Symmetry: D2
Subunit: 401 residues, 4 copies
Amino acid sequence: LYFQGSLELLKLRSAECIDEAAERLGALSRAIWSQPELAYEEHHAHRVLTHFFEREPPAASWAVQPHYQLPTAFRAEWEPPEARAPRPLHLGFLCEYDALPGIGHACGHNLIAEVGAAAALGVRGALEGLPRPPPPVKVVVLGTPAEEDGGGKIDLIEAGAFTNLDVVFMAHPSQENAAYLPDMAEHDVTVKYYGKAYPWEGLNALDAAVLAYNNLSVFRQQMKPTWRVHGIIKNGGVKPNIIPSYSELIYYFRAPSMKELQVLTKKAEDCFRAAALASGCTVEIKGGAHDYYNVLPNKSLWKAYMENGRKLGIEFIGPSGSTDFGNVSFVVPGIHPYFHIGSNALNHTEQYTEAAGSQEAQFYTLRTAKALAMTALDVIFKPELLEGIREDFKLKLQEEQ
Amino acid sequence: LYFQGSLELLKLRSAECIDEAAERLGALSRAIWSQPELAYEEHHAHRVLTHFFEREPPAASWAVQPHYQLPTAFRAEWEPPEARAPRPLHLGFLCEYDALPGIGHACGHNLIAEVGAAAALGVRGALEGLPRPPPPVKVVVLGTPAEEDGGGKIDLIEAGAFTNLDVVFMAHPSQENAAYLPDMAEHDVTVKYYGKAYPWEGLNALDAAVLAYNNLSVFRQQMKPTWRVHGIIKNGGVKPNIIPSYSELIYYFRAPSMKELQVLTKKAEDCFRAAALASGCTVEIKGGAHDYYNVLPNKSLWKAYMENGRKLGIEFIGPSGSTDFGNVSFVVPGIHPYFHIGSNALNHTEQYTEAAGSQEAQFYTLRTAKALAMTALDVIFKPELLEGIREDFKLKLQEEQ
Amino acid sequence: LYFQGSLELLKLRSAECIDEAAERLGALSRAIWSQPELAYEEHHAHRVLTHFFEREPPAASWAVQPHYQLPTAFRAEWEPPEARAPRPLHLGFLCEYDALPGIGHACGHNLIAEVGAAAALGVRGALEGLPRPPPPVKVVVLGTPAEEDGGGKIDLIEAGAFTNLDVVFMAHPSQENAAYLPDMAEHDVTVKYYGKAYPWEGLNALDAAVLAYNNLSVFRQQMKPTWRVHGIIKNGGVKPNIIPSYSELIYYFRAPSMKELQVLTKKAEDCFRAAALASGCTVEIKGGAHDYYNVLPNKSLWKAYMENGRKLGIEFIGPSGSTDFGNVSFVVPGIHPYFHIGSNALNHTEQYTEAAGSQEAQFYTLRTAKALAMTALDVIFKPELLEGIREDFKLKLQEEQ
Amino acid sequence: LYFQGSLELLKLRSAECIDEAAERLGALSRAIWSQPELAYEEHHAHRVLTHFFEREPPAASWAVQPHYQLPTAFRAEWEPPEARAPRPLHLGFLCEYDALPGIGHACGHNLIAEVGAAAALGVRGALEGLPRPPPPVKVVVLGTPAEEDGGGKIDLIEAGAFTNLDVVFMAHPSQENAAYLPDMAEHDVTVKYYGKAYPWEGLNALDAAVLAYNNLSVFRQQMKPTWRVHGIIKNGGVKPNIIPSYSELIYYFRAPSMKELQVLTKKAEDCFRAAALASGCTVEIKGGAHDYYNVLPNKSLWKAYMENGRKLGIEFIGPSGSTDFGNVSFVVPGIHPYFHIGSNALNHTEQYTEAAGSQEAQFYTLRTAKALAMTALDVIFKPELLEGIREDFKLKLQEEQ
Ligand SMILES: N[C@@H](Cc1c[nH]c[nH+]1)C(=O)O
Ligand SMILES: N[C@@H](Cc1c[nH]c[nH+]1)C(=O)O
Ligand SMILES: N[C@@H](Cc1c[nH]c[nH+]1)C(=O)O
Ligand SMILES: N[C@@H](Cc1c[nH]c[nH+]1)C(=O)O
Ligand code: NA
Ligand code: NA
Ligand code: NA
Ligand code: NA
Ligand SMILES: [Zn+2]
Ligand SMILES: [Zn+2]
Ligand SMILES: [Zn+2]
Ligand SMILES: [Zn+2]
Ligand SMILES: [Zn+2]
Ligand SMILES: [Zn+2]
Ligand SMILES: [Zn+2]
Ligand SMILES: [Zn+2]
């Protein structure tokens, strides 16, 4: 309540500290939105975000590590400069910023960078505005490039960037406010067929591509209704007067779990290899470098986030049904809420790029950032919540194993 | 020429002996045409043909063996009753008589029985009307049922009925007069798919049938243009509300040689097994009991037959592109000429049944029978022709091996 | 409460009246379960159910109409014999009883007949055990044959059997207790292709069936994930040596609404007609006599039923995702709850036939019948519930239009 | 015979005049073979061939028209400079020279240019070496670019280049010597599908391409065995995460006649439009600018050419089963013999490029050129042959109409 230094007063300070930084946070959003960059090519966004945390007053109070493990990734850390002779809490906030080809930031990833920077700013301000000994906490900001292709979070996982985080937060703009939305696991694959080019002495690799297409097509009747299979024939011949000795298909499969994705992938391999057997061609089946994991929910973290958004005016009920945050949620307890930004346009469409950079979207972005910061304060000052977050994380991890 | 007992005079007697038997040979044709019977069910035709050779005067001069190896097959033999203390010539004439379902004798097999009986009658009469010692010859008539399905000639081959024949003759009515027409090799197959019948827990055997159909369909572009593949989906499900756990296809393949038929059959097996792999079903691939061989030609026998038909007024240029006579031609030198019967209708059509039983067809049938009988006389009295027939048979046999 | 003639006391009497009839209701179940009969062939079940209501004491107090509109359908009615010089309430209870081929009553329809007869018995006993003037109510039992094929309820709808009913009740055994489960709309179709049977002069009707199969197969990627399409190739040729001039497919489509089912059906027609265009065959597309409607829920009726089952010990969370009760729910407000019967077996499986006729299933059947009877008493004595049932019915009807 | 100025002596002079020019004709072949150029890009070959006829002694005795109608086409004409106050004979010889991409002159078109230039040289020398009045003849050489793609002869036909020719000659190197080989008619087509890119709101243009492929594939069973259909999927999608709204196929069809090609093309259009109907996409079907005609034979011209090659030592028994000479043969009586060049390699293969430029091929090229020149002399001095050539041309033209 009104009591001296209550948790309610700290959550207020975090909201006021975000409102005070509304101007430069909006400039951060515009800087990324105006210069859209693709996966692993976000050099300007990396410059903009690293400079942002460097200039945060007092300068160098955020320990910033540019080019952290990836050329466009970065890492910024803050803790209250104090000690007393007992493990500190590590709270992580992620910033995405890569855009889509041709249409710009049609996923509103400029707002994801803004909302992750704002939440970390609000947490520090709430702890800064605390007298007495502040509890041991380290605020960690991680710039994770290449969400839309590659999986920069996975590259960071392989570098050990998430091994010492206790909780991780981010948020993603969408069409409705939901503390959790089902993002599925994904496996990418490239299929190449090789034949030999008098057509009686011919192995038709284009036949193999079409037969593979037919094999998967009739299989759709027996897929679990939650499964997804989409693919194209990238290469289906060059000239009609020569038997195509080469064909190439590119597919990706999605299932709500790693176990179900393995069954779907084996079923697809059977379809690809059957096309080789029927056509006489040889086949190479090459999976992508990284499989995307489904996002594990965290019940305790979820319920605490919803209670904070309710006080803020958020009414609760994604874009791509898979994200590399799923790999993160498998190693660190996290939440990935989606938030409405004042538009009816769909993600990955041109009209969403308009909404992502609009002035109307800034209110919804900064409001959701406030909810993330207050939820982070909840974990800091409620040990029973932190244990409940860990129990929910351990239980969910056993089922998915 | 006019000389006492010339080969020209013997060929005339064979023609006169056939003309004299025109009445009862036509009755033989009508008896089979009027009561059409299917493969291995030709009990009446067997009765009619056995009685025919039994009543040939003097009675029992034809040694007739009814129910020879097959219930509806038979065997009739004649030789001049004389000896002198040096291997005799065995000349075979085949009679087919099985009809087609529904449309009757749309292949004119009633005329095949007539033409084989007439040729053997003409040969005996030409030798009967010879004074002095007649050369050692045995005229053998073989009733071969089930040409249109099963291959009764093959059943007779397995009984050793052709192991002591030197030359074999028959003729088949068609649309044009040709001393030889390309009949191909054939392999029949029945394909059965087995799945398991909540459709996510389903193996769709109907998918396997359709995928097998697609696999063979695109393969048609790479088949040799002389190859043929035809098939049906005999069983493709029973009720739509149950995943079909069983499917059944029936196919036959044709190629001009045994070697090429093996390549086509292996290619088809790959298509059938690929459908099993793509659908998850198991597959049984069951070939027919008998493969049909292509008909080997005999150049010497061919040229001698054409020279005899030319003197008779026949002008030279089939129904099913495969016949069990091909298996016979592989073990005995033979000819299988086709002859026009005064009709434009196609074989295996209702309007050919009309032509096969017409009065107009009797002249063309008895004329071709005359050509067969004279050709048989050529082999009897020209040792240089018999050796040339055997050399052509040995050479053709090596290529097809 | 304990008050003289409370609604709570009437619900108790209905439960006691059902418990008293447990013996003969179980005999009713066994009589139908032991002699399984198919759609429109349920002559014995019709005899058993009509005799049941005739012998209910005092005899002829149930006005029974055998062979009502359908040969195996029936109608039984009861009202308190009294008047006073104001429209009476008509409450309907449905009895299903047709079984499945081969596996018997694998849907537990013997229990559906029992539960509908028991609920109507319990309502009459609760009203019988009421002194003073009883409110004007007519209990109507309708025997609806051919649920699993045909749609006997639709035949009864066309006879006007539901035009004077205010509320209608039934229940269906399943795996879990749910006051409502999504049953979809369904449209059946039979597709026939006609060609012309020298294969160059051939229209292949089997090609049309396979091409239609392929057209629908690739369409599955673009169907709404709630849609369902299942079909078979009933006729795909007779002999491989003749081009198939005829083919036949049987399909059914399911969508959660009539509007969505029309879009799916037009899309399928495009696939069927495209196969005709590609093959050159003509096509006949014949829809089933009756389309099945999706089941409209009724919120007020639903919530009242759940509150009654809770007092009975039922814990709340189908077989065929479509039923002719959906057509009934479109013209009369109704509920179609599913109830667990002590088994893990799935509907339409052999092991569910075991559960449907077991002694263990009688407790769950009679318990759910008690819940139906108490819910019927709620409608009789709560005018605010009846109006709320009608408002929910009118609102739901506008959306589905 | 030996008589003063016999036709036999003129044919000898034509052979001696070709033998004398063997050196510079071989240089002509090497100049084109060493610098392979593609359709309509044969600038160097045009320079080489125009300069060849310009430098033929006496210079400018060949009236050469460079850049004739096409940039790389040309025209050279010679006649004996004399008059007398009765229509002259126009004899045409064609030179091809365009090569194949990547593999060079794998069709030996360098030899086609050489053989057409040599035959025209031999004819002029035979007429030059004639005293007295020479009959009125004009030797016309036409450079026809872009045989392997485009049809430069057709461009020349549209300019009227063949309207005043009486007979036309060329020759094409192959594997065996044949005065005529069946080259078929050809029709090219490009098929484009347009859809609309939430996959439930999607028209899949890749489905249209695959369905079109399946439609044509099953059609192969019913094509006439002389027909040919080959095609590729040039564009079958770009990224798997977007429904392909565009697809592109490229096909060509071949039939032995224009009438049969029209039936095959309509059947293919039905397959392409059916894919549009099944997928919901719109389709554009665009045929090539020029259809290729089948080559009409000329019996009289054929028999005269074979009699000349026999005297030369040629023993008689193509690459692409269609050529733009077929369009020429439809408007001018012509022959297009194929000739062996000392190699077993196949046309359009790398090893044929080796043979085309070898020293071994020069003897066979110059020998066939001698046969063309003598055949041209036959037409000049046998009026009964010229009339027979025209009667055969008129009769063959009526059947193909
Ligand atoms: N198929 C998507 C999946 C995805 C990952 N991140 C965003 N989208 C891709 O191309 O990467
Ligand atoms: N496929 C044909 C082949 C044949 C053999 N004999 C006559 N026809 C069959 O059913 O037997
Ligand atoms: N497809 C099912 C649908 C159904 C209606 N009732 C029960 N099941 C049928 O054959 O009728
Ligand atoms: N399909 C061949 C046909 C052809 C014409 N000339 C030579 N080849 C082409 O691409 O042109
Ligand atoms: Na600011
Ligand atoms: Na007689
Ligand atoms: Na009782
Ligand atoms: Na020279
Ligand atoms: Zn995105
Ligand atoms: Zn995104
Ligand atoms: Zn036949
Ligand atoms: Zn036959
Ligand atoms: Zn059922
Ligand atoms: Zn049921
Ligand atoms: Zn070429
Ligand atoms: Zn060429």
